[PDB]
Write a protein that binds this ligand. Sequence first.
Ligand SMILES: O=P(O)(O)O[C@H]1[C@H](OP(=O)(O)O)[C@@H](OP(=O)(O)O)[C@H](OP(=O)(O)O)[C@@H](OP(=O)(O)O)[C@H]1OP(=O)(O)O
Length: 175
Amino acid sequence: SRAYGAMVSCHMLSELEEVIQYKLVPERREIIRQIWWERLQGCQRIVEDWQKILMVRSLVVSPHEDMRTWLKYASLCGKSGRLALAHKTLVLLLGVDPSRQLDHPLPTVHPQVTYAYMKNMWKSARKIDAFQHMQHFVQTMQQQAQHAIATEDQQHKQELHKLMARCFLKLGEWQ
Ligand SMILES: O=P(O)(O)O[C@H]1[C@H](OP(=O)(O)O)[C@@H](OP(=O)(O)O)[C@H](OP(=O)(O)O)[C@@H](OP(=O)(O)O)[C@H]1OP(=O)(O)O
């Protein structure tokens, strides 16, 4: 346990070497990203270590290019009593600020990021407006899925169905 800090330092150095590999090799990008995700999953859930590792990885990976890792990090921050940083990460991922545009509905792009932001807002005691946004988002998702049902998109349709089931469960719990 006393050596864990040095272990994190070694992890960061290895990530740096893998970053130079990511820069050099254009066909290794997906493999490198999967390795980073799995190795980060292996590590402890301390916010500071995750922040250091993500800063290291940011040299070649913008947050938009990998929304899953930053969503996990934001969830960890939210569960660690740092809702300010979690909201900052969510608004960075979305690209627009729902806080300033209260009247404007939440964006539909990146539905996973939207759902994460909505649950963070629910944790932010803004329950009624969060529920209103959730109703609007469910209506948008169902109508968009109905319009965009096609044989080409099935895995996307399955993920959309999973997210919609989660949204329905959250709607029931919050009601
Ligand atoms: O913290 P909660 O509100 O209960 O949400 C949990 C939590 O989601 P976050 O990634 O946003 O934290 C779980 O993540 P863990 O921190 O436990 O790893 C996730 O589980 P997975 O990591 O397996 O995706 C699970 O998702 P699901 O219910 O689809 O299994 C999801 O639950 P809700 O989406 O229903 O809130």
